[PDB]
Design an enzyme around this catalytic site. Structure first.
Site, mmCIF file in Angstrom:
data_model
loop_
_atom_site.group_PDB
_atom_site.id
_atom_site.type_symbol
_atom_site.label_atom_id
_atom_site.label_comp_id
_atom_site.label_asym_id
_atom_site.label_seq_id
_atom_site.Cartn_x
_atom_site.Cartn_y
_atom_site.Cartn_z
ATOM 1 N N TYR A 124 0.811 -1.232 0.000
ATOM 2 C CA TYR A 124 0.000 0.000 0.000
ATOM 3 C C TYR A 124 0.837 1.272 0.000
ATOM 4 C CZ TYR A 124 -4.507 -2.316 0.342
ATOM 5 O OH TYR A 124 -5.612 -3.064 0.080
ATOM 6 N N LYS A 170 3.565 -14.402 5.383
ATOM 7 C CA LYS A 170 4.182 -15.266 4.320
ATOM 8 C C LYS A 170 5.712 -15.213 4.354
ATOM 9 C CE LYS A 170 2.153 -17.972 1.213
ATOM 10 N NZ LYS A 170 2.342 -19.440 1.262
ATOM 11 N N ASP A 203 -2.136 -18.350 4.220
ATOM 12 C CA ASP A 203 -3.087 -19.175 3.489
ATOM 13 C C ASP A 203 -3.787 -20.145 4.448
ATOM 14 O OD1 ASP A 203 -0.680 -20.580 3.742
ATOM 15 O OD2 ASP A 203 -0.839 -21.514 1.754
ATOM 16 N N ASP A 227 -6.530 -6.717 4.375
ATOM 17 C CA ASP A 227 -7.652 -6.378 3.477
ATOM 18 C C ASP A 227 -8.465 -7.629 3.133
ATOM 19 O OD1 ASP A 227 -9.172 -4.799 1.579
ATOM 20 O OD2 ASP A 227 -8.050 -5.862 0.025
ATOM 21 N N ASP A 231 -12.427 -9.051 4.790
ATOM 22 C CA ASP A 231 -13.648 -9.317 4.010
ATOM 23 C C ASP A 231 -14.097 -10.774 4.174
ATOM 24 O OD1 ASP A 231 -13.672 -6.647 3.118
ATOM 25 O OD2 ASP A 231 -14.297 -7.210 1.056
HETATM 26 N N1 LIG Z 1 3.774 -27.455 -1.954
HETATM 27 C C1 LIG Z 1 4.497 -27.290 -0.864
HETATM 28 O O1 LIG Z 1 5.679 -27.641 -0.811
HETATM 29 C C2 LIG Z 1 3.886 -26.670 0.225
HETATM 30 C C3 LIG Z 1 4.654 -26.450 1.378
HETATM 31 N N2 LIG Z 1 4.150 -25.802 2.500
HETATM 32 C C4 LIG Z 1 5.009 -25.703 3.693
HETATM 33 O O2 LIG Z 1 4.428 -26.695 4.589
HETATM 34 C C5 LIG Z 1 4.793 -26.313 5.941
HETATM 35 C C6 LIG Z 1 3.527 -26.310 6.777
HETATM 36 O O3 LIG Z 1 2.712 -25.185 6.327
HETATM 37 P P1 LIG Z 1 1.278 -24.865 7.005
HETATM 38 O O4 LIG Z 1 1.087 -23.395 7.142
HETATM 39 O O5 LIG Z 1 1.281 -25.620 8.363
HETATM 40 O O6 LIG Z 1 0.187 -25.532 6.096
HETATM 41 P P2 LIG Z 1 -0.242 -27.074 5.888
HETATM 42 O O7 LIG Z 1 -0.926 -27.183 4.566
HETATM 43 O O8 LIG Z 1 0.981 -28.034 5.864
HETATM 44 O O9 LIG Z 1 -1.255 -27.484 7.039
HETATM 45 C C7 LIG Z 1 -2.124 -26.541 7.608
HETATM 46 C C8 LIG Z 1 -3.097 -27.345 8.481
HETATM 47 O O10 LIG Z 1 -3.880 -28.245 7.654
HETATM 48 C C9 LIG Z 1 -3.716 -29.575 8.160
HETATM 49 N N3 LIG Z 1 -3.572 -30.453 7.019
HETATM 50 C C10 LIG Z 1 -2.954 -30.189 5.878
HETATM 51 N N4 LIG Z 1 -3.032 -31.283 5.110
HETATM 52 C C11 LIG Z 1 -3.685 -32.237 5.776
HETATM 53 C C12 LIG Z 1 -4.020 -33.506 5.486
HETATM 54 N N5 LIG Z 1 -3.679 -33.991 4.295
HETATM 55 N N6 LIG Z 1 -4.685 -34.285 6.346
HETATM 56 C C13 LIG Z 1 -5.046 -33.764 7.573
HETATM 57 N N7 LIG Z 1 -4.676 -32.455 7.861
HETATM 58 C C14 LIG Z 1 -4.007 -31.711 6.965
HETATM 59 C C15 LIG Z 1 -2.402 -29.573 8.985
HETATM 60 O O11 LIG Z 1 -2.419 -30.576 10.068
HETATM 61 C C16 LIG Z 1 -2.342 -28.160 9.506
HETATM 62 O O12 LIG Z 1 -3.004 -28.004 10.795
HETATM 63 C C17 LIG Z 1 5.432 -24.904 5.839
HETATM 64 O O13 LIG Z 1 6.876 -25.011 5.924
HETATM 65 C C18 LIG Z 1 5.007 -24.388 4.466
HETATM 66 O O14 LIG Z 1 6.000 -23.456 3.960
HETATM 67 C C19 LIG Z 1 2.812 -25.403 2.490
HETATM 68 C C20 LIG Z 1 2.047 -25.637 1.359
HETATM 69 C C21 LIG Z 1 2.537 -26.281 0.188
HETATM 70 O O1 LIG Z 2 6.820 -22.671 1.508
HETATM 71 C C1 LIG Z 2 7.079 -22.265 0.340
HETATM 72 O O2 LIG Z 2 8.218 -21.978 -0.089
HETATM 73 C C2 LIG Z 2 5.938 -22.189 -0.708
HETATM 74 C C3 LIG Z 2 4.558 -22.131 -0.078
HETATM 75 C C4 LIG Z 2 3.552 -22.359 -1.218
HETATM 76 C C5 LIG Z 2 3.125 -21.077 -1.951
HETATM 77 O O3 LIG Z 2 2.719 -21.226 -3.115
HETATM 78 O O4 LIG Z 2 3.140 -20.005 -1.318
HETATM 79 C C6 LIG Z 2 2.254 -23.016 -0.677
HETATM 80 O O5 LIG Z 2 1.528 -22.150 0.235
HETATM 81 C C7 LIG Z 2 1.386 -23.456 -1.878
HETATM 82 O O6 LIG Z 2 0.179 -23.168 -1.877
HETATM 83 O O7 LIG Z 2 1.966 -24.065 -2.788
HETATM 84 O O1 LIG Z 3 -10.108 1.787 -3.238
HETATM 85 C C1 LIG Z 3 -9.121 1.984 -2.525
HETATM 86 O O2 LIG Z 3 -8.204 2.783 -2.782
HETATM 87 C C2 LIG Z 3 -8.976 1.222 -1.203
HETATM 88 C C3 LIG Z 3 -9.914 0.043 -1.005
HETATM 89 C C4 LIG Z 3 -9.690 -0.317 0.449
HETATM 90 C C5 LIG Z 3 -8.362 -1.041 0.686
HETATM 91 O O3 LIG Z 3 -7.940 -1.061 1.847
HETATM 92 O O4 LIG Z 3 -7.811 -1.604 -0.268
HETATM 93 C C6 LIG Z 3 -10.824 -1.225 0.921
HETATM 94 O O5 LIG Z 3 -10.864 -2.469 0.207
HETATM 95 C C7 LIG Z 3 -10.690 -1.538 2.427
HETATM 96 O O6 LIG Z 3 -10.646 -2.747 2.728
HETATM 97 O O7 LIG Z 3 -10.644 -0.587 3.242
HETATM 98 MG MG LIG Z 4 -11.083 -4.355 1.660
HETATM 99 MG MG LIG Z 5 -0.666 -22.065 -0.238
#
Ligand SMILES: NC(=O)C1=CN([C@@H]2O[C@H](COP(=O)(O)OP(=O)(O)OC[C@H]3O[C@@H](n4cnc5c(N)ncnc54)[C@H](O)[C@@H]3O)[C@@H](O)[C@H]2O)C=CC1
Ligand SMILES: O=C(O)CC[C@H](C(=O)O)[C@@H](O)C(=O)O
Ligand SMILES: O=C(O)CC[C@H](C(=O)O)[C@@H](O)C(=O)O
Ligand SMILES: [Mg+2]
Ligand SMILES: [Mg+2]
Ligand SMILES: NC(=O)C1=CN([C@@H]2O[C@H](COP(=O)(O)OP(=O)(O)OC[C@H]3O[C@@H](n4cnc5c(N)ncnc54)[C@H](O)[C@@H]3O)[C@@H](O)[C@H]2O)C=CC1
Ligand SMILES: NC(=O)C1=CN([C@@H]2O[C@H](COP(=O)(O)OP(=O)(O)OC[C@H]3O[C@@H](n4cnc5c(N)ncnc54)[C@H](O)[C@@H]3O)[C@@H](O)[C@H]2O)C=CC1
Ligand SMILES: NC(=O)C1=CN([C@@H]2O[C@H](COP(=O)(O)OP(=O)(O)OC[C@H]3O[C@@H](n4cnc5c(N)ncnc54)[C@H](O)[C@@H]3O)[C@@H](O)[C@H]2O)C=CC1
Ligand SMILES: O=C(O)CC[C@H](C(=O)O)[C@@H](O)C(=O)O
Ligand SMILES: O=C(O)CC[C@H](C(=O)O)[C@@H](O)C(=O)O
Ligand SMILES: [Mg+2]
Ligand SMILES: [Mg+2]
Lengths: 333, 333, 333, 333
Positions: A124, A170, A203, A227, A231
């Site tokens: 922002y 993140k 996420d 933001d 919502d």
């Molecule tokens: N594609 C990838 O390599 C990805 C890697 N990550 C990494 O994974 C690690 C953990 O990230 P989080 O924020 O904890 O997200 P996460 O997706 O690993 O889990 C978040 C929550 O969902 C639950 N959960 C996820 N998958 C499940 C399953 N298959 N069965 C039952 N429960 C499940 C977990 O127990 C946890 O409480 C981090 O280091 C993150 O950076 C996260 C998403 C994707």
């Molecule tokens: O832990 C990482 O380096 C990647 C996380 C990754 C992302 O796309 O942000 C995960 O949240 C996913 O949805 O793949």
């Molecule tokens: O229209 C704009 O310039 C701001 C929208 C504004 C934001 O914070 O992004 C609105 O979505 C909000 O959540 O306050």
């Molecule tokens: Mg908003």
């Molecule tokens: Mg993700």
């Protein structure tokens, strides 16, 4: 005599701010209203979305209540986003966004959380450039702003029954920007040993809000992330019709509904004024009128429970009819 | 035989990928599985999260099935996030994340949408810098990448009966970067007259997903935005235990659960392998085995409806007990 | 008649441009002069340093001759650098800056070189941000701008006796920006086999210009680098009272002295108009009046050799006297 | 004894560093020399341009005398410029670069100035990115680094008889970055009421150095600008064969010639070692051996005046021959 700055803005701003005013009037409190302008319509008539006069009037008041302003989705010469401008200029660094269950059909029960969004930086900062067919924007995280938003969120959590704070981030993808934010908030948490501090990747935070919002007390996060999560959370407890906020700095505050100008319903006579009225309640709280705040909230809840209801809550009531129900409910308390 | 590269990663990857391998084995297709390694544990032992050998194995296969890899929340010298490196290196520009109502208690009915997430740029460009106490990351949007992801999302929308695409963006605050994305997708949509293209601000999109996810068909958005919206959407339809995805470029694809390594449950034998299994179904479809892909999805829905169920779905089945139920149901089809 | 836009600008622009006009009038050519405004004094009077009218007038003429304009060393609301705005807006990508020995005491003999400076990007995109006590500026180099400046400089070298081009750069410390510039100019050089192409690190280049400027033919370099080297070069051949330039794009051109508004001598009656006059000579060449150009240059040389001289050349002549002497010399050729 | 770290580097560093050592030995001071390696050959052997062992040696000695190191004009995975690494890692924030008339053919008389260049930030921050065919570098200026370099230059000016400092900048084009530099140096100037402080635009500064270098005492400027201006000034007083420097931090210092590895004459045993020997004299000053410094400087001047002379000075002497004459002149003083 409390000086309140009233700013309507665009679209449903013209509808929900007069409603909020009518409810504030019905508290009996001594209130002097000062009108000012901002938004797209103000840009069209005065050449700027935020006239200097409007800043003066805000600063001359104890607090401000803002409706909403429309923003284009492209560059428009001379135009900048009104509320965003006000946030950075008045240094309203804390955006406080509570999500509470209310007695309406569209609301998950058991929810009572606050999202605390950093309100000055991140994406922002709006420092974008285009070079040929590549566009770049700065995402900026400073230690200073992270300390201030962190401290704000910690105070809020310390003041609440569950004393729990989740830091949504993140850092795993952005360890310098999101990591500075995370670590700085954890650092200032050391001055709040009553607060239980947890971190959550943003996420996951969003999936947890959908599935088990009851688990959250206070969530602190950065500008764009907040933001989005705010919502989402509104959707969990009846929608943007009900969601209030405060843009709070060290010397002033601007209270506004989370929702925007809602041009799809502006002029239909049906916008739900609850978000603006509850923003006014937060405003009364900030001024030191806790009792009146609670009465306003009570009044709104009575009406939400027994009707009449606006179409966003599945009813058929006009904005006018709903506002009047709330005024009468308040008068009876 | 189809050559399928298998990569477990970290945490529950070691549990759900073998499960998915067992279900693929029960399809009766000729499959040669090529094992490779990547992730945090791989970095500890080899000094890099993605050995070159792994890249070569992926390129030598028809497709890859990937578990999940852990990343730290701080800079670690020589470490880069594994899936992100693969995404950029192999140019897997389209992240396809279906969200579809399934017959389990945690699930909204009537949801059938696809989030098409730009998988290459935005904030994931990873060009961060720190100067004293200010950190800065690049958020980059290019016409080229936006064209490609826009075309991919339009192709998917065109192939689906409701012929609708929503472009989720934040161009009201970021008109140069998010605005380029918005405009470019709208431009390329001119070659797709049959598709109804709508645009929606991402915070409002998040509220709409919570309140009325049934109104969405296909959604296209940028990198971080799609990260968040797709975990949101997983929550609507039973959770991260069920959500599949594909990372798809012009010449390869890496299929994987939306979920991470889930260290809170790693090693306990209870992770839901449905997300990995459905990602294998997406892979079967990518390779041209559509009938086999449907049979796998059907087996899964049979087991989800009639049990046994893992603890994320309110049951007490182990990962292997659930897998055996799916293999048994698959073989009865 | 050739239409010539005259823009005086600030300071000594008011003095040297009328002088150059007088020399153009004595060529005998059919010239219609069109006056336009730019600079600091224009900003004070009109609210902008380059009114749109000035842009239209420039485009409605065959060529423009510009004096110089003062720029603050700080932000001033509404003010932007005039000449830099014109360079970017009218895409005058090649800044052609010759340095040639003249018969005056301050001048090294045996020098005949051309500095071709990219006039559009580098540090001059002017995209700066300030965050707390840290300030960042973009330094941008694109393949496209480097191709155009490379070609412009190779064409100029190809048409001169020695056919030698030196690429001055800092690729050694900035391999992605300066390296792109370096590599791109070398790549377009493949279409110019007539030219001996060398590269040189810019600091070394500065030392070589001081010690043996006679070694150089054409030098091509980036925006800020060429700004510096071109002032250096002027100092070798009599100084800024003598140094001309053209800002040349594909469809129009603005000729101007290398020197600025010289506020230390503005209003003293002594500024050397040679630089402006030689720029008018360059303009004549661009317009295809080469013989007129050579006559103007010859008249200039005669007067520099015989006197009278302005104080910057050790003499005591007023601008007026010097001008009249050049007019008289011209008419006698 | 003083522990002196000696690093040869590449090219003529292998010739001028042993020379400087020879002259140091001949001073009759207790000196232990500690050898260490860095540069491009070093990168080829050991995989890094600066082994940890070398940093350790630097930090274990009272000062370091560095040769010069080669660097390529393109990205080379694993390679970073050696001296630039040491400058940033050891925080050698002041690059002190004196230019003084010497009794030799290629020398302007009456020159005695010091360029103090900020040695840490600006464009040397090393933060480039390439997105499609657009490359971007950070140019960073901080108030802190500016205060620091400002105060260093102010102290040097205060210690000299003419008490004058010029600030060379380009704040007219870059008011936020170069402006912050300018303004900060001016702020810290308030603690040095004895110093006359002037500002000058860097292009004009280059021209003034060419025409009247005798007007300058101390010049302070940013990183890249100082690089260019200091090679320019070497040209004025006999060239890079003679120009010395110190990279001075709070707790350590690396002295080195202004010149590079000079690959055009590396191997021929003709490089002028004066720059290296004068950098050793600056180092003696730094160590408190002020009188030995003055003797080394006097010895060099006697040989430059009376011969023998290296080719760069129009003679035929070898590096050794020149060196032996300097040793003999030092011994007779
Ligand atoms: N594609 C990838 O390599 C990805 C890697 N990550 C990494 O994974 C690690 C953990 O990230 P989080 O924020 O904890 O997200 P996460 O997706 O690993 O889990 C978040 C929550 O969902 C639950 N959960 C996820 N998958 C499940 C399953 N298959 N069965 C039952 N429960 C499940 C977990 O127990 C946890 O409480 C981090 O280091 C993150 O950076 C996260 C998403 C994707
Ligand atoms: O832990 C990482 O380096 C990647 C996380 C990754 C992302 O796309 O942000 C995960 O949240 C996913 O949805 O793949
Ligand atoms: O229209 C704009 O310039 C701001 C929208 C504004 C934001 O914070 O992004 C609105 O979505 C909000 O959540 O306050
Ligand atoms: Mg908003
Ligand atoms: Mg993700
Ligand atoms: N503080 C501000 O100035 C804000 C401005 N905006 C601006 O508003 C404009 C429109 O934004 P949108 O994305 O369309 O979001 P929105 O928040 O204005 O509306 C989104 C949806 O929620 C419904 N809604 C919102 N408030 C409602 C209410 N009080 N009663 C019944 N329904 C309500 C709307 O009808 C619409 O369907 C944009 O230019 C946006 O930038 C958005 C939020 C805050
Ligand atoms: N094209 C343009 O608009 C240009 C504008 N400028 C602006 O000029 C202003 C003053 O800049 P300076 O750094 O002082 O550089 P300058 O070029 O105006 O003057 C530098 C020195 O050269 C002398 N000089 C220049 N032209 C001369 C002439 N024609 N005859 C005799 N002496 C001459 C001046 O007296 C002064 O001492 C600044 O605001 C700068 O931005 C500078 C160059 C070009
Ligand atoms: N401190 C360091 O590590 C430095 C390293 N470099 C690197 O050095 C390499 C050479 O780059 P150049 O642009 O050629 O700069 P350079 O400084 O090595 O030489 C430029 C010209 O000056 C002459 N010269 C320099 N020192 C001399 C001496 N002591 N006696 C006689 N002649 C001398 C050279 O022959 C050459 O023609 C590059 O790789 C550059 O990146 C350049 C400067 C400093
Ligand atoms: O004052 C300005 O905005 C620009 C000055 C201008 C430049 O190119 O930097 C001037 O020095 C020049 O050489 O044209
Ligand atoms: O080539 C390199 O990495 C360093 C060059 C180095 C510089 O400071 O730019 C050199 O020109 C110098 O003057 O120290
Ligand atoms: Mg200039
Ligand atoms: Mg240098």
């Amino acid at each position: 005599a409390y000086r309140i700055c009233l700013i309507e803005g665009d679209g449903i701003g013209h509808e929900v701010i007069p409603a909020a005013r009518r409810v504030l009037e019905a508290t009996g409190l001594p209130l002097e209203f000062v009108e000012a302008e901002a938004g797209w319509e103000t840009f069209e008539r005065r050449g700027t979305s935020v006239p200097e006069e409007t800043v003066e009037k805000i600063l001359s008041c104890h607090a401000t209540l803002f409706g909403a302003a429309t923003s284009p989705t492209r560059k428009v010469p001379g135009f900048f986003g009104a509320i965003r401008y006000l946030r950075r200029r008045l240094d309203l660094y804390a955006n406080v966004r509570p999500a509470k269950s209310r007695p309406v059909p569209g609301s998950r029960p058991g929810v009572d959380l606050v999202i605390v969004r950093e309100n000055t930086e991140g994406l922002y900062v709006e420092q974008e450039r285009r070079y040929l067919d590549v566009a770049i924007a700065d995402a900026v995280i400073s230690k200073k702003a992270s300390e201030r938003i962190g401290r704000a969120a910690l105070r809020i959590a310390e003041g609440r029954p569950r004393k729990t704070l989740h830091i949504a981030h993140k850092a795993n993808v952005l360890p310098l920007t999101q990591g500075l934010f995370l670590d700085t908030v954890k650092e200032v948490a050391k001055d709040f040993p009553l607060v239980n501090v947890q971190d959550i990747i943003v996420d996951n935070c969003a999936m947890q809000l959908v599935m088990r919002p009851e688990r959250f007390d206070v969530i602190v996060t950065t500008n764009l992330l907040g933001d989005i999560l705010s919502d989402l959370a509104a959707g969990l407890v009846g929608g943007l019709g009900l969601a209030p906020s405060g843009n709070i700095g060290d010397t002033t505050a601007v209270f506004e509904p989370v929702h925007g100008s809602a041009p799809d319903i502006a002029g239909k006579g049906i916008a739900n004024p609850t978000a603006a009225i509850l923003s006014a309640a937060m405003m009364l709280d900030y001024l030191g009128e806790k009792e009146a705040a609670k009465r306003v909230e009570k009044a709104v809840d009575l009406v939400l429970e027994r009707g009449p209801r606006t179409p966003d809550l599945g009813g058929d009531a006009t904005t006018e009819a709903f506002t009047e129900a709330v005024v009468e409910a308040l008068k009876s308390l």
